C-alpha cells in the first residue's frame, strides 16, 4: 500500500461519523436533484427515479469486517466515478444551478475522505496489499432523457445504499 | 381519338431520416414524343393506409423531345419512422395542335418505404431545435399500449396510428427553459420520453466600436440583443473577420459565468492605417452580421503612466519623466500636466512630446514656485481628440527652496 | 547564519472556511527566507503552502478541509546557506474547529411568574456534526460585571433554557457562546445581546403613611391630611396605577377612595378611625397598612426627652434616649425657619427599635432647621419636642 506513516486508532468512529454525514448529504442531494431536475419528474418519481440499477456492487451485512470493508471500498469507488460523471453531465445540461454543484462537490470530497480512511484501516489492520477494482464504460450518454433518468435512478439507489450502510456499520 | 399518356414509372425513392424528408426522382419518356407539348406532373403523398395527406402539382415541358431526369423533394410533418408512406405519380399531356380529347394517365405502380427498427430509441424526433410557435408532431413507436402523453403537464389528446402506435399534435409550442421539455409517453410500467428545444434567432449585435491601447492589437467588444434561450453546445458563436486582409478570430465560451459584454482580441497588421471589420454570428436557427469602419489612428486610448518620479537638478523646477508602455514612436503625445497650488488654484498647461521606444519619457517645465504645498498630476491625450488617459498616482516631491 | 527551527507549530481551523497553521520566527538572520508548509494525509499529499513575502504570518492553503481525517503538517525554512525542517504533529481538524455564535436570541416573560424567564436561540449549522456546549452570562439593565451561569447546566445540545430566582420588574441582558462539548477547541464569538423584562406580580410589604390633622375648624369638625411616600421602582414591581385607602369606625362610617395623587383632603369627625392603605397594580392582591388616629382630648402621653441634633458629619444625626416600654413608631418632622415666610415640613417613618438615624431630604447650608420628633403610641401620638441645629 506504500503507507507513509502509521494511521490513527479511532478510524472506526471516524468512518461511522463519515457514514452518518454521507447519509445526510445523500438525502439532501437527492431532494435537491429531484427538485431541480424538471416538472414531470416529481409527479412520476416511482417510475422515473426507481432504485433499480443494472449493475451495482452488492453488500452483505452478515459478512466479516474485512469483507464489509472491501465491499465498502468497491462501492465508494463506483459511487465516486458515477458522481463525477453525473456532475459533469449536470454542469453541461444546467449551468444555472449552483447549490446542486456545491452539494455534489462536498459529497465527492466526503466520499474521497472515507475512501482514504477505509484504505488506511484495511492496509494497517489486515495488510491486504492490493485490491481488485473493475472499471466500466460511461453507461450514460447520447440521450438527454436517458441521462436524466439514469442519474436520478443512480442517486436513488445511492441514497438507499447509504441509508443501509449507516445502520450496517 | 382519345390521347392517353403512357403510365410513368418511379425510378428510385429515398428518404433522409435525419431531417425527415423524402427524395423522389423520375425520368419522363420524352424521346418517344417529338413535339414540345406542355405537361403537368402531380405527386400525391399518401400515408397511414391511403389517407391522402397532401397533393402537389409540378408544371414542366419536354426538352425538345429528350429524356432528362427531374428530382423532387418534400419534407414530411411526421417522422418517417412512425408510419408507412406511399407515393405515385401520373401525367397529363396537353398538345396545342391536337383536336381529340385528352384524359389523365393511370397512376404509377406503388412504391413505399418502411423504416426497419435499427436503434433502441422509440420517440422521434431527437433533440430537435425549432422556432418558437412552429407546429411539430411527436410520435412514439412501441409494442404495448400507451396510456397518455404530456409535455407541459397538460395531458394533450393522442391520435392513433396503424400498428399499436400513438402520436400527439402540439401546436404553437411555448418557450423552453435551459433544459428541453420532456415529451413523455406513460406506458403501463415504463416511461419513454425525449426533449424539444424552442429558441429564438440570434439578434444583431449592437454597439460595435473599438479603440486601441497600443498600436499592436485592437479590442472590439459588443453586447447581444434578445436572449436566444439556448445554453450549452447549441449556443451562438460570434466570429470577427477582416474584409481587406481576411484574417479572423474566434471567441471562446469555455467558462459558464460569462461577463456582460464580450471583448475580442485582434492583432494589428503592419502599416495598414485602415480597418473595415465585419462581425459574424452563427446559430442552428439563424444568423446575423454587422460591419463597422474605424480609423485606428484616431480611435486610440492611451494607458495611464506608471512608475514616474518628481526630481530635478538645483536649477529651475522639476522636469517630469513618466513611463508609458506600447508602441507610439510614430505619433506624438499631448500629456497635459495639471499643477495644483496649496488648495487654492490649479492651472493647466500642455506640451508636446515625440514618441520613443518602450521606455520612459522626458519633458521640461518653466519657473515653478517654491514648496507652497505643490502637488502633481498628469493626464495624457493626443493631438487627435479622444478620451483622455486615466489619472495616475499623485506625487508631491518638491525641489528644495530657500 | 542558518535560521533556527521554526518551532511552536501553532495551527487553527475555522468552520465554513479553510484552515491555517502558524509557527515561530526565530532570529532575523539578515537574509530572505521562504517558509514552505507541508501537508500529508499518509496516503496522498497536496500543494505546499507558500508564505507571501509581504505578510508571511500563518499560511495560504488551497485544499478544502475534511473532518475525521488526520493530517501531518510541518514547516520548512531555508536560507541561502543551510536547510532545516521543523517538527511534525498529527492532529484531527475536527477538534480545532471554531464554531459560529448563535443568532436570533429571543426573550419572553412568563405569566404570573416574575423570577422564571425563558431563553430561546438558534443553533448554527455545525450542530449536526459535533455536540455543542453553551456558556451564558447575564446582568441587569445597568451593570459592570456579568453574572456567570453554572456551566454544569448548559453542558449538552439544547434549544431553550429557563432562568429562575430573579427579582421582579428588573430588565436583564443575555449573551451566549458555544464550542465543542469535550472542551477541545476554541470558543466562539459572543452573540448579539437580547433584552428582557420580568413580571409585575405584587408590590412590596407595606406602603407606610402618616396622617396630619388641624385643630377644630368649626366646633369639633377637623380636617385630616393623608400623605404617603412614593415606592421606589424596585419594590413596587411595576408602574404605579393608583392608590386606594379605606377608613371605617364608629358603627356608621365606611368609605373608599381611588385618588391618583398622594394628597387627598377629606373632612372627618372627632371620633377615632382606622386607616388602611393599599396600592393597586395591574395584577391586584395588594397589601394593606394600618394607622390609628387618636381621640379628641389626649394628654401629653409620654413625651420625648433628651433630643439632640448636631453636625459631624454631612448629615444631621438625631438621637434620643430609649422611651417607655410601649412605643409603636417614630415619625419626626422638620422645616426651615425662613424670615418673613412660613415653613413647609417634611417627614419620614422610623421603626420602634431604632432610636438614632439620619434625615433624608434636600437641606441647605447656613440655615436653621427646627426638627420635631413625634412619638407614636398605641392610643395616639405623644407630646413632641423641638430642637434647632445648623448644618455647617
Ligand atoms: C412496400 O415495399 C416493399 C419492399 O420493401 C414490398 O415488399 C415486397 O413484396 C413483394 C410481394 O409482396 C415481394 O416479392 C418482395 O420481395 C418484397 N420486397 C421486400 C420484402 O423487400 C411491399 O409489398 C410494398 N407494399 C407494402 C404494402 O408493404
Ligand atoms: C401561441 O400562444 C401564445 C401564448 O400561449 C400566444 O401569445 C399571446 O397572444 C395574445 C394575442 O395574440 C396576447 O394577448 C397574449 O399576451 C400572448 N401571450 C403570450 C404569453 O405571449 C400566441 O398568440 C399564440 N399564437 C397564435 C398564432 O395564436
Ligand atoms: C468594407 O468593405 C466592403 C467592400 O467589400 C464595403 O462594401 C460592403 O461589402 C459587403 C460584402 O459582404 C456588402 O455586404 C455590403 O453591402 C457592402 N456595403 C456597401 C455600402 O457597399 C463595406 O461597406 C465596408 N465596410 C464599411 C463599414 O463601410
Ligand atoms: C485616419 O487617421 C490618419 C491619422 O490621423 C489621417 O491621416 C492624416 O491626414 C491628414 C490629412 O487630412 C494629414 O494632415 C495628417 O498629417 C495625417 N496624419 C498622419 C499621417 O498621421 C487620415 O486622413 C485618417 N483617415 C481619414 C479617412 O480621415
Ligand atoms: C433571524 O431573523 C431574521 C428576521 O428578522 C432573518 O434574517 C434573515 O437571514 C437570511 C439568511 O441568514 C437572510 O437572507 C435575510 O435577508 C435575513 N432577513 C430577513 C428579513 O429574512 C432570519 O429569520 C434569522 N436569521 C438568522 C441568521 O438566524
Ligand atoms: C508559542 O508557545 C507559547 C507557549 O509558551 C504560546 O504563546 C503559544 O502556544 C505559541 N504561540 C505562537 C504564536 O506560536
Ligand atoms: C523562496 O526562497 C527560496 C530560497 O531557497 C527560493 O528557492 C524560492 O525560489 C523563493 N520563492 C518561492 C516562491 O519559494
Ligand atoms: C367603593 O365603595 C362603593 C360603595 O358602594 C362600591 O360600590 C365600589 O365598588 C367600591 N370600589 C372599590 C374599588 O372597592
Ligand atoms: C390621575 O389618575 C389618572 C388615572 O385615572 C392618571 O392619569 C394618573 O394616575 C393621574 N394623573 C397624573 C397627571 O398623574
Ligand atoms: C368639610 O367639613 C365640613 C364639616 O363642618 C362639611 O362642610 C363637610 O363635611 C366638608 N366639606 C368638604 C367640601 O369637604
Residue numbers in the entry:
A (entry chain D): 34 to 202
B (entry chain B): 132 to 533
C (entry chain A): 124 to 515
From the paper:
LIF forms a 1:1:1 tripartite complex with gp130 and LIFR, and the signal transduction does not require a nonsignaling alpha receptor. The gp130-LIF interface has a larger buried surface area (1412 Å2) than the gp130-CNTF and gp130-CLCF1 interfaces, which is mostly caused by gp130 engaging LIF N-terminal extension (residues 34 to 42) preceding helix A. Consistent with the crystal structure of gp130 D2D3 in complex with LIF, the LIF N-terminal extension serves as a “doorstop” to hold gp130 in position and creates additional interaction interface, which might be the reason why LIF does not need a nonsignaling alpha receptor. W164 and F191 of gp130 also engage LIF analogous to how they interact with CNTF and CLCF1. While gp130 largely covers the middle region of helices A and C of CNTF and CLCF1, it is positioned toward the N terminus of LIF helix A, leading to an increased distance between the bottom centers of gp130 D6 and LIFR D8 in the LIF complex (~34 Å). LIF is primarily docked onto the saddle-shaped LIFR D3 through its helix D and AB loop, with additional contacts made between the LIF BC loop and the N-terminal loop of LIFR D4. In addition to the key residues F178 and K181 in LIF helix D, P73 and K80 in the AB loop also make extensive contacts with LIFR.
Glycoprotein 130 (gp130) is a signaling receptor shared by interleukin-6 (IL-6) family cytokines (or gp130 family cytokines), including IL-6, ciliary neurotrophic factor (CNTF), cardiotrophin-like cytokine factor 1 (CLCF1), leukemia inhibitory factor (LIF), oncostatin M (OSM), cardiotrophin-1 (CT-1), IL-11, IL-27, IL-35, and IL-39 (1). IL-6 and IL-11 signal through gp130 homodimerization, while other cytokines require another “tall” signaling receptor, such as LIF receptor (LIFR) or IL-27 receptor subunit alpha (IL-27Rα), which forms a heterodimer with gp130 for signal transduction. The extracellular domains (ECDs) of gp130 include an N-terminal immunoglobulin (Ig)–like domain (D1), a cytokine-binding homology region (CHR, D2D3), and three membrane-proximal fibronectin type III domains (FNIII, D4 to D6).
